[PDB]
Amino acid sequence: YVHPTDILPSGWPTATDLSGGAQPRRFEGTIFDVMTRGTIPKELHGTFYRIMPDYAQPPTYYKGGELNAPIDGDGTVAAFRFKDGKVDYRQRFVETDRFKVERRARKSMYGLYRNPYTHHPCVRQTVESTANTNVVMHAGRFLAMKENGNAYEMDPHTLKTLGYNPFNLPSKTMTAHPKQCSVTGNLVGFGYEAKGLATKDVYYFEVDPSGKVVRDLWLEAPWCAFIHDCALTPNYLVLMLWPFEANLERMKAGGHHWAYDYTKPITWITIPRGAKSKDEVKYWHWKNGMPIHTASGFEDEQGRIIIDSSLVHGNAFPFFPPDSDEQKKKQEADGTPKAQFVRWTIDPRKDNNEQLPDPEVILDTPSEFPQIDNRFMGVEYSSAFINVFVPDRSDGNKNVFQGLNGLAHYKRKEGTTEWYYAGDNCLIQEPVFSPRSKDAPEGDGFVLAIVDRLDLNRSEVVVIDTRDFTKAVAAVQLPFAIRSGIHGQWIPGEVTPDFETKGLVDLPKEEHWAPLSQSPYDPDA
Ligand SMILES: O=Cc1ccc(O)cc1
Ligand SMILES: [Fe+2]
């Protein structure tokens, strides 16, 4: 059986997200009082903000959109607000310069990921960010982020776009991975390609709790590398260089911004916090591989930098292949690479010209999207909440982003791992943590994540109490599916302006439309 209407032609290209899911969603709006199962913890007081790629227009501009990447599509924010056991939902597109152009034209006008040479001539000198990667609340300002531009600011309640570059950063770019220091309250980050397309320049910054840049430095990367993520320690910002190189000539020729390079080692840039000179910066190297995301970093008793990350032993983004024919064949040969969770040791006192020691295998399982207890951000931490391929319960032939069917709670101090299984015909997305109370022990509280109910065509928010990591306490049940996203964040009420007075949904007026006389009911009848 084939449905007769199903053979009617579509104009849409295949627009994947990171999961490999290819269904456009693109809805903007609200559900008041989202259906829940079980008991929503009363301790939840805040918003789960999630961001997703969801091409608003069919991306047909360049090569009919055949080379669209899962990381490409227009940023849409989903908000799940938890107040007094009740859940509200809002979804809205980031009103990026790109989004607004495409909507107004009813037409795709942008080409390849980070390639202005493949955009429509009229839009080449625009901010080309889809603001689709990560969110942050800092100094009462809510930001949607993507590494190829400054953030766009959004209202935390309506999700209305308010402007571009709220902190007025001098770089062309800002990381989608800044870290909120638990010591200073500073927004610590960077922007690479800080001076334009294929530039080696890196700008480091620290934005204080009052929204002022208090520390900065202009530096360079050893090559124009893909510096997606970083680690924050007491004394350092540690940049993590993926083995991809940008090439302006290739871009001009209508090739991809990035090419994977087997000859490049995993490289780290150590930046002393509040460094007075670029002379203080050191480059460290290991071997070829792709460490996608950090859990976090710290300094041990010996003063050594300790960073946990995912590690893929090859290209986790095969849609950005190598330049050379030889290297292309290597990618094909690698297939689905080995994927682990690993521990790095960078001793800042050692010779940085000497190759770093091999990382320690922490989990011999495909691992992605780690988060921590952010009360321990930029200090010694123990808890990691990791998006996992569940041992003996998962594929493993899948690309690292495409088989994530569980959660792991790792504790360094205890040396224990606990496992949550998403369900049969289910995927689960990045976990976020909310502490039981302000003074609760590290990693004691609630874990939230988006579950794709694949055979149901619905998305859910699972709620797990850390006292029993194997079991859900609650589910937030959407009537539909949303896109499989990238990052999300737990944002507490206390850091959100006007959380006490504003919901996700604007309340209707109190006053009745109808006069008293219009009632069917008479109290005398
Ligand atoms: O998760 C990886 C990622 C990399 C670059 C992007 O622009 C977005 C996401
Ligand atoms: Fe990321």
| Among 453, 390, 451, 452, residue whose Cα is nearest residue 418 | 390
CA distances from 132 to 268, 291, 305, 478 (A): 25, 20, 30, 21
CB burial class (10 A; 0-12, 13-18, 19+) of residue 36? Answer: middle
Give the sign of the dihedral formed by CA 42, CA 43, CA 45, CA 49: negative
Q: Give strand pairing partners of 269.
A: 239, 283
Which residues 6+ apart lie within 8 Å of 31 measured at CB?
A: 88, 89, 478, 479
- Cα distance between residue 224 and residue 141, in whole Å: 30
DSSP states of 478-518 as a string?
A: -SS-----S-EEEEEGGGSTTTTT--SSPPPPSS-SS-GGG
Mutate to test the pocket of ligand 1, among 147, 319, 399 (most ligand atoms within 8 A of CB): 147
Which residues does a gap of C–N over 2.5 Å follow in the chain? none
In degrees and rounded to multiples of 5, residue 413 shows phi and psi of: -60, -50
| Determination technique used | X-ray
Q: Does 91 contact ligand 1 (Cβ within 6 A)?
A: no
| Among 341, 338, 486, 313, residue whose Cα is nearest residue 410 | 341
CB burial class (10 A; 0-12, 13-18, 19+) of residue 44? Answer: buried
| Resolution in Å, one decimal place | 2.0
Q: Does 87 contact ligand 1 (Cβ within 6 A)?
A: no
Q: Does 487 contact ligand 1 (Cβ within 6 A)?
A: no
- Cα distance between residue 214 and residue 53, in whole Å: 33
DSSP designation for 290: B
CA distances from 158 to 89, 222, 238, 404, 496 (A): 11, 42, 35, 31, 13
Q: Does 71 contact ligand 1 (Cβ within 6 A)?
A: yes
- Cα distance between residue 134 and residue 432, in whole Å: 13
CA of 54 relative to ligand 1 center, distance in Å: 14
Q: Which residues belong to the annotated binding site for Fe cation? A: 177, 228, 293, 487
| Among 78, 186, 181, residue whose Cα is nearest residue 132 | 78
- Give the number of whichever ligand sits closest to the CA of residue 114: 1
Contact of 108 with 92, CB cutoff 8 Å:
no
CA of 225 relative to ligand 1 center, distance in Å: 13
Q: Does 228 contact ligand 1 (Cβ within 6 A)?
A: yes
Q: Does 129 contact ligand 1 (Cβ within 6 A)?
A: no
Q: Sketch the domain layout of the chain as residue ranges.
A: 177-364
Contact of 234 with 378, CB cutoff 8 Å:
yes
- Cα distance between residue 403 and residue 365, in whole Å: 11
- At residue 271, what is the residue type? I
